Amino acid sequence: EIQVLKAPRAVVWKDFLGVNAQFLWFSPERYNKQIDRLQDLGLEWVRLDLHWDRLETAEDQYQLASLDQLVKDLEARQLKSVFYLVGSARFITTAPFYSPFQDQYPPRDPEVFARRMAMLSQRYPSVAAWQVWNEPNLIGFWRPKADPEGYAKLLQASTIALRMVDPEKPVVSAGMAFFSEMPDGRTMFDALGHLGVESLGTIATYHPYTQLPEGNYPWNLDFVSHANQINRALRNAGVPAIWSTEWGWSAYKGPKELQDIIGVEGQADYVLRRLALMSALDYDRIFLFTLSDLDQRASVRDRDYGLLDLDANPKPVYLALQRFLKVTGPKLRPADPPVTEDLPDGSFSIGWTREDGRNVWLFWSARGGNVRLPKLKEATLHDPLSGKVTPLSGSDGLEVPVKSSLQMLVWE
Numbered sequence: 087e088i089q090v091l092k093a094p095r096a097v098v099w100k101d102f103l104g105v106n107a108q109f110l111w112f113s114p115e116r117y118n119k120q121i122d123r124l125q126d127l128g129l130e131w132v133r134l135d136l137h138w139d140r141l142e143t144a145e146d147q148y149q150l151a152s153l154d155q156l157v158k159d160l161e162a163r164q165l166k167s168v169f170y171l172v173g174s175a176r177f178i179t180t181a182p183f184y185s186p187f188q189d190q191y192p193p194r195d196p197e198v199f200a201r202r203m204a205m206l207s208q209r210y211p212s213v214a215a216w217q218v219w220n221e222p223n224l225i226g227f228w229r230p231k232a233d234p235e236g237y238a239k240l241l242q243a244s245t246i247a248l249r250m251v252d253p254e255k256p257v258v259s260a261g262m263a264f265f266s267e268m269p270d271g272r273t274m275f276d277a278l279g280h281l282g283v284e285s286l287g288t289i290a291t292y293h294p295y296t297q298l299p300e301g302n303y304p305w306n307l308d309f310v311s312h313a314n315q316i317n318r319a320l321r322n323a324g325v326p327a328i329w330s331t332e333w334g335w336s337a338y339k340g341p342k343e344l345q346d347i348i349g350v351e352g353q354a355d356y357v358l359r360r361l362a363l364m365s366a367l368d369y370d371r372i373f374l375f376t377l378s379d380l381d382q383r384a385s386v387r388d389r390d391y392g393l394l395d396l397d398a399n400p401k402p403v404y405l406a407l408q409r410f411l412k413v414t415g416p417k418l419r420p421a422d423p424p425v426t427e428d429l430p431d432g433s434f435s436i437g438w439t440r441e442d443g444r445n446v447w448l449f450w451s452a453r454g455g456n457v458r459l460p461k462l463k464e465a466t467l468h469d470p471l472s473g474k475v476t477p478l479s480g481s482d483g484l485e486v487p488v489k490s491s492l493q494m495l496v497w498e
């Protein structure tokens with residue numbers, strides 16, 4: 087069962103591939119070093135989390151100094167930022183008095199939240215887009231149960247308030263967990279659609295984390311199918327844009343909590359394979375989770391999603407992504423794979439052209455094996471995980487080794 091992808095449009099990495107970032111967890115010295123490493127990749131989009139109960143610690147009493155300095159720094163470094171605000175301040179929460187998760191409940195009055203997003207947008211005009219809440223389909227962000235009507239009211243109040251500040255600035259709806267599935271068996275995209283939320287014209291976004299790059303189980307690699315189905319439905323509903331605001335894997339050692347243990351090399355492999363899929367699907371922009379490893383304030387799994395370690399130095403996934411983007415160059419146009427014979431069962435196959443006009447073939451298969459390219463006499467094979475570069479030549483076609491990990495064939 088071979089999966090061939092051809093992107094719907096050209097991809098310019100600087101415009102398309104952003105990273106999540108937790109810069110408020112770090113000193114400016116440290117986060118500026120993270121930004122150096124991001125710029126070295128040729129990227130500029132960042133997505134940052136804001137927690138209302140950290141920003142407003144009592145009614146009308148705020149802690150803005152670190153955020154003020156961060157926004158100044160992001161503007162000085164010429165990054166493009168989307169910030170999301172999530173959680174309830176203590177004075178406004180619907181949490182019962184005894185809950186240990188006071189901010190994981192929605193606000194008693196959505197207009198109060200809306201006024202804070204307007205205050206942030208007015209304070210920080212350099213921010214490129216504002217996002218309303220996070221994963222409202224997940225209990226840990228919206229207790230005690232998912233509530234499409236409640237989220238729709240929150241998104242409407244926020245959209246109106248943000249547009250009063252700046253009618254041109256994008257309003258991004260919350261990144262939905264997974265493909266927006268809810269515990270009750272509905273999906274938040276379907277439920278919001280039945281409420282007519284598309285009339286608000288917010289950017290739609292979801293967080294399609296799966297165990298493997300191409301699906302959750304080896305016998306059901308349905309990531310492409312599932313993403314295509316959700317993205318077609320969002321386009322049919324008239325969304326202005328589709329982003330994926332989080333995806334990725336943790337290099338953590340364990341103990342296992344949801345994600346299987348794959349380590350730094352598994353992180354590098356899986357991120358590159360998933361990037362090869364998502365950059366050929368119908369997203370306008372995607373954001374890898376996440377730029378940096380985090381300290382003990384994060385959950386054990388959440389500490390190790392970084393491109394960078396705690397010193398802001400490259401992990402294997404950063405070096406692999408760097409090699410991949412150097413091979414592609416800055417802009418890819420959709421193309422077709424080379425003609426193949428005996429491409430292995432289960433292969434993934436994506437063709438592009440680079441700015442120099444040469445073709446790039448991204449391919450892999452769990453079975454490994456070999457493939458014949460009968461019409462080529464010359465090409466170069468790059469393994470972004472190891473850095474190996476292999477010139478291939480044949481009088482009557484090429485034989486190319488296929489790996490479980492992504493390789494890139496560059497050919498004329």
Ligand SMILES: C[C@@H]1O[C@@H](O[C@H]2[C@H](O)[C@@H](CO)NC[C@@H]2O)[C@H](O)[C@H](O[C@@H]2O[C@H](CO)[C@@H](O)[C@H](O[C@@H]3O[C@H](CO)[C@@H](O)[C@H](O)[C@@H]3O[C@H]3O[C@H](CO)[C@@H](O)[C@H](O)[C@@H]3O)[C@@H]2O)[C@H]1O
Binds near residue numbers: 332
């Ligand atoms: C960077 C990370 O991003 C988001 O989480 C990602 C997650 O990392 C990935 C991978 O697992 N999955 C998708 C998801 O989007 C969140 O922004 C994370 O922040 C959280 O935001 C919640 C809503 O504001 C907070 O409730 C949450 O707070 C933690 O709660 C756990 C218990 O569930 C505590 O163990 C932990 O200490 C945190 O609680 C402190 O902070 C709360 C928020 O200020 C306070 O209300 C609480 O009293 C504690 O001081 C977390 O902040 C984000 O980290």
Ligand SMILES: [Cl-]
Binds near residue numbers: 107109111
């Ligand atoms: Cl942050």
Ligand SMILES: [Cl-]
Binds near residue numbers: 110135137138140
């Ligand atoms: Cl915050």
Ligand SMILES: [Cl-]
Binds near residue numbers: 423424425459461462
């Ligand atoms: Cl060919």
